């Protein structure tokens, strides 16, 4: 289970289990993907089409 996220001409992937820091705010859900062991990258992603497993994981309705 991976999520594609190409910034421009460089494809990047972020794991859902490694994204510890996460908080919903505004339209774009911000997050802090751990990748460096000290640098800690950071980005965001709009909620126009988030994965199906990400919405069920955080939003545990039933």
Short structural summary:
The protein has one helix spanning 52-58; strands at 2-4, 13-15, 19-23, 29-33, 43-45. By secondary structure, the chain is mainly beta. It has a single domain (1-62), classed as Beta Barrel (OB fold (Dihydrolipoamide Acetyltransferase, E2P)), CATH 2.40.50.40.
Description:
By secondary structure, this protein is mostly beta strands. It has one domain: OB fold (Dihydrolipoamide Acetyltransferase, E2P). It is built from one helix and five strands. The protein has a three-stranded antiparallel sheet, with no helix packed on it. It has a two-stranded antiparallel sheet with strand order 1-2. The longest helix has 7 residues. The protein is globular. It starts with a strand and ends with a helix. Homodimer. Its EC number is 3.1.27.-. Can constrain negative DNA supercoils. May be involved in maintaining the integrity of the genome at high temperature. Has RNA endonuclease activity with a narrow substrate specificity; the cleavage products are 3'-phosphooligonucleotides.
Helix content: 10-25%
Integer-rounded radius of gyration: 12 Å
Largest beta sheet: what is the strand line-up? 3-4-5
Strand content bin: 25-35%
Q: How many independent structural domains? A: 1
For this structure, the CATH topology is OB fold (Dihydrolipoamide Acetyltransferase, E2P)
Number of helices: 1
Distance between the termini: 21 Å
H/E element order: EEEEEH
The computed structural class is mainly beta
CATH architecture: Beta Barrel
């Amino acid at each position: 289970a991976t999520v594609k996220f190409k910034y421009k001409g460089e494809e990047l992937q972020v794991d859902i289990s490694k994204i510890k820091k996460v908080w919903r705010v505004g339209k774009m859900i911000s997050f802090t993907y751990d990748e460096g062991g000290g640098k800690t990258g950071r980005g965001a992603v709009s909620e126009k089409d988030a994965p199906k497993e990400l919405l069920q994981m955080l939003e545990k309705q039933k």
